[PDB]
A paper describes a structure:
Drug efflux pumps play important roles in intrinsic or acquired drug resistance to a wide variety of currently available antimicrobial agents. A small peptide, AcrZ, has been identified that modifies the activity of AcrB. In this study, we report the near-atomic resolution cryoEM structures of the AcrAB-TolC pump captured in both resting and drug transport states.
The inhibitor MBX3132 likely binds AcrB tightly, since it is active in the nanomolar concentration range, and the compound was used to lock the pump in a more homogeneous conformation. The 3D map for the pump/MBX3132 complex was initially generated without any imposed symmetry and exhibited an apparent 3-fold symmetric pattern. Thus, refinements were performed with 3-fold symmetry, which produced the final 3D reconstruction at ~3.6 Å resolution. Subsets of particles show AcrB conformations in LLL (1.4%), LLT (6.2%) and LTT (18.6%) states, respectively, while none of the subunits was identified in an ‘O’ state. Therefore, this inhibitor-bound pump conformation primarily represents a T-saturated state of the AcrB. Comparing the structure of TolC in the crystal or in the apo pump with that in the inhibitor-bound pump assembly reveals that TolC adopts a fully opened state through an iris-like dilation of the periplasmic end. In the presence of inhibitor MBX3132, the AcrB trimer is predominantly trapped in the symmetric TTT conformation, possibly because the inhibitor has high affinity to AcrB and cannot be transported. Thus, the cryoEM structure suggests that inhibitors like MBX3132 could effectively inhibit AcrAB-TolC efflux through saturated binding and blocking all sites and prevent AcrB from cycling through different states.
Author numbering:
A (entry chain C), B (entry chain F), C (entry chain I): 1 to 428
The structure:
């Protein structure tokens, strides 16, 4: 298919992606965990309880049966507000981790897609080598049947033929592996894939890296997740700062308490005090609590999270020196791959002129049919490493746009505007 | 040694294995952690307490010395029953994580074993190259001492000889590293290792991939650990479903409580109320508690673990597409590596013909002794990449069986039925 | 720059190192977290409370306003003393994890330094190839303009020229990458770097491995972190052994308690019992608690940490066989790399003689100017793989010392006493 229908099946059915989409749904749901202790805590509680004295307290035994309804509320506790702000930012992280995994799918689909078109073409290469080096064997054998070569040059040329098998079988094996790199990323065995339109394919010079990198610092996802990790661990400071701050929570505990006596001291005058006490109480109010001095535990956690922030503030700079290396890598990979194509497109023009010197040289007779088929195979060796350079250009645009972070389904379209007529993956 | 005694020392003495075997013992012991809160909580407590009033409550001060024995019990709490069921499945995971690490030890021993026999033979290769390219040098020197060559053809031939030293030293160094890859996996320096019996070695065609992969899905361990990953996080939903369900526990708190007064209000009529009260109580009964509304914390944890299950459900489909690429990789490696052998088995028959064209060509005199020894080295270049292809076939059987999960000490024996006569590992 | 000023900017500005430097400051600060529950726990609490009876308990309602100051103290709990000892040893681990990252900086500075001087010289190589293979093109063209070659022999030679573009562009791309590998580790673009002084550089024979590995076991940082990992998990046993031990903690809870009635049963005789009870209490004493039987939770955690220790004792043996492999690897890498040098230094002496056979051959006229420049590029091929062997010798000294753990700024000086005169990183 065209690469979009390869990607649009891959977008809906990537298990590497739908896992992260679930964790992006998990982290956004994890905010509702964090905002929930700010919401009330209504819980029912019931008790049966039989006290049993065995001393001076013997004879006073009671079936104190009490049921109660508790409600507590985070009136003022800035840690839960911070843990809300922690969890939003960690969800802001985990949205970016998803935003990587869109582009990671977009990249690795086209990577696995063009590795099929590589291996489709290597299959077209090596069967044109097996039409050649078997033809080399099928005449070095037919020289030995006459007497032109020694038995080495047969048993050599068979070994040069059987190496063609141990390359062409691997070509047929790297075909199915590349298909199963692609089923791994999309979901299905794909019969035909869209080959590259050489007519609508241009060697565009990319944008200058000083404009790329400042665009990368607004968008790139290793950097952006490292920004928000710094934004995460800065609030981890202020969480530990909220152990200094007091904890004011609300008390609301309502419920019955039936307290019925038993035992030997129940036998008595009972003094208008010893009756089957059937009571009920509703305690409303507030619970204030301030940690004054926890042995500097809170100050330790503040001092911990400060170095943990400096530990995280290096992970910005760890990534912020890494994006500069990564952006300049792909920009200096594509500038390689532009000159790589303008080599291997010239290397086609060699092996196209060298082939057509043979076809004219065989039509008049000076070169033989096996110097044709070797030069045919010399042509397809150009046209792999042409196409492989044509794919690694089209990959390294995506390696730019992913390292820019601007990678989407629009840069994918600029690939798929160049993929016009299909070629199959079926070993003939 | 034969591969079994290499493995049987490795099976008993692999720190990569025994750490997992300790963790397989640590995971099954962790089940007894899970079943332990279902068992009682018998704990003895004791208190000394001097109340000190300083207000209207001054004068009522007491050395309240109380010692109490406590017992509680998980009467009804489905989360602990779930945590029992989680931990059995999570140790059901970690049993499979061990079951990988048996086969990982089976494979990586055979990987490190056959990398010795490779590196032994490269050592036998490169000294048959150093017997060759030295005689290449040691005649260009004698051509220069006469005058047949320029000083370039000596200092080239010294450089082509010194490259052979820069390979035969690495062959000796990759020998000792291969021994130390083997000592890393087994435990000892091994003096002689069993070379491959070429007579009882066959190029068997493997079972078809439609039979392999359906046998893989019943057995394969990355998949099986991912199935039980799904089975673990499915119950993590039902753990979070047990925040809905109430918590019924038992109360058994029994013990003395001596209350002996002090202060100014102790001086008085005492009302037959103010004595050194020496008491003791046994509270039996049940503790019921139902979380009604925790701010949707419980529902969020359900909704967390639902999407966390989908992430685990995608990690099955991650691995269930990753088993297919892994199984077809090995099945398309071994189909290559058969043809790789029949390539380099012919490359021996080429080079053994080319060698015997020299030994007959030197015994009559047409080719010289260095054109022999170059073609001798051409023979041993075939007999690496023969034997290396003989090992990579025998490795990729284990890359099948480990990616099938059927790898055991029986597929090991099919390797070791082919390793018959020993060869040393000492550079002569 | 010389390598020290490259390192001394890298020492002060490595975002990988300063991250671990903060984590080294984190774990040492985390000790003060561990010693803090041994320190007192002073916390202020305050309550407002309105009881609301609705039964036989109706009419008794009160504004029980109580404020309380609490202080608790770890009198006797050996787990906190163990968790102090756990944290110090985990800080003993994390100090070693820093000590790796000193050397990991020292190595990867020198590695990324010597990969610039690799790529500088490949840039000096490949322009001498483009000063050669362009002259190969620029006279096959002038053979064709007269008629000595076919159009295949030009369009091949153009393709051999355009491959030299597709290397020399990558040489300039790998130049900027190596500069940005260096900016990634130090912090800046560096204009000139000190090339290797070949005169004061020697091919020293290293220390024997029987002394190295015993000096490694006293010093090496993977192994030392694994020892302290074992030293960590042994105390993890003695933590869970301190669940057996009792928990004696101090009670110091002091504070007011103002209890002012309200309701219908407040109206009454009041019995010198029902007043605005404005009270206050100070509870001093101790809290003793002994877990007798937690369902075998404590024994299981002992039995967990025992098998977890054996896993850690295998992680010693995991690393302790790994260091034996690692130390012998670098020692057998540098023994390779010395013989690599005396290969590629001889390969200079060939390609110096083969060049000087051209300069004496072109000055008299037998060989042409392109056979000069092709043999010049033959020289600069030797001078990469000499210099690369001159760099891999100097790296594999540090791969010894980092896998010894004796790597510091003194072995770095033995590098930098060989880096004398600067060469630049600017493609001319």
């Amino acid at each position: 298919e065209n690469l979009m229908q390869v990607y649009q099946q891959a977008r809906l059915s990537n298990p590497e992606l739908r896992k992260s989409a679930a964790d992006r749904d998990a982290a956004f749901e994890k905010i509702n965990e964090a905002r929930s202790p700010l919401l009330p805590q209504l819980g029912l509680g019931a008790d049966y309880t039989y006290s049993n004295g065995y001393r001076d307290a013997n004879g006073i035994n009671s079936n104190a049966t009490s049921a109660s309804l508790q409600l507590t509320q985070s009136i003022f506790d800035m840690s839960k507000w911070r843990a809300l702000t922690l969890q939003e930012k960690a969800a802001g992280i985990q949205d970016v981790t998803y935003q990587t995994d869109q582009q990671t799918l977009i990249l690795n689909t086209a990577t696995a897609y063009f590795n099929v078109l590589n291996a489709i073409d290597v299959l077209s290469y090596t069967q044109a080598q097996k039409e050649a080096i078997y033809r080399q064997l099928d005449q070095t054998t037919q020289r030995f049947n006459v007497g032109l070569v020694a038995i080495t040059d047969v048993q050599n040329a068979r070994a040069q033929y059987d190496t063609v098998l141990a390359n062409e079988v691997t070509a047929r094996n790297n075909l199915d592996n590349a298909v199963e790199q692609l089923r791994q990323i999309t979901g299905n065995y794909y019969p035909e894939l869209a080959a590259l339109n050489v007519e609508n394919f241009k060697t565009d010079k990319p944008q200058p890296v000083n404009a790329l990198l400042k665009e990368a610092e607004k968008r790139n996802l290793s950097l952006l997740q490292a920004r928000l990790s710094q934004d995460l661990a800065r609030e981890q400071i202020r969480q530990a700062q909220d152990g200094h701050l007091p904890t004011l929570d609300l008390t609301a505990s309502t419920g019955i308490s039936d307290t019925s006596y038993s035992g030997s001291k129940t036998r008595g005058a009972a003094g208008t005090q010893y009756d089957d006490s059937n009571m009920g109480q509703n305690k409303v109010g507030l619970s204030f609590s301030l940690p004054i001095y926890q042995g500097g535990m809170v100050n330790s956690q503040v001092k911990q999270a400060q170095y943990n922030f400096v530990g995280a503030s290096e992970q910005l700079e760890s990534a912020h020196r890494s994006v500069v290396q990564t952006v300049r890598s792909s920009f200096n990979n594509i500038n390689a791959s532009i000159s790589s194509i303008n080599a291997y497109k010239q290397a086609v023009v060699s092996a196209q002129s060298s082939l057509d010197a043979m076809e004219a040289g065989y039509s008049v007779g000076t070169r033989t049919i096996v110097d044709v088929l070797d030069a045919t195979t010399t042509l397809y060796n150009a046209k792999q490493e042409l196409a492989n350079a044509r794919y690694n250009y089209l990959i390294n645009q995506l390696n730019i746009k992913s390292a820019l972070g601007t990678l989407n389904e629009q840069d994918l379209l600029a690939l798929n505007n160049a993929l016009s007529k299909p070629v199959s993956t079926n070993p003939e």
